């Protein structure tokens, strides 16, 4: 596997969507990534680019599916 770390452009896209979804790395996405990728991920910067692209796909699905309830 390519272990190239996540780049800043992909990170910014992820962050934009987390903010839009009212979700966070600490509460929501890092726990989920840790479960999905079956490794201890403690900071956003520790994702690989390949992992981040999967997470970004998932967040686009969430943001496109439905409105974020108040």
């Amino acid at each position: 596997r390519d272990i190239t770390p996540v780049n800043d452009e992909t990170m910014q896209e992820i962050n934009t969507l987390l903010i839009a979804l009212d979700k966070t790395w600490d509460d929501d996405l890092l726990p989920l990534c840790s479960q999905i990728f079956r490794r201890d991920i403690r900071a956003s910067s520790e994702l690989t680019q390949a992992e981040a692209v999967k997470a970004l796909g998932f967040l686009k699905q969430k943001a496109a599916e439905q409105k974020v309830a108040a």
Partner: peptide
């Protein structure tokens, strides 16, 4: 394995 292709709540 649950993965990001799956329909997980978030």
């Amino acid at each position: 394995w649950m993965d990001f292709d799956d329909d997980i709540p978030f």
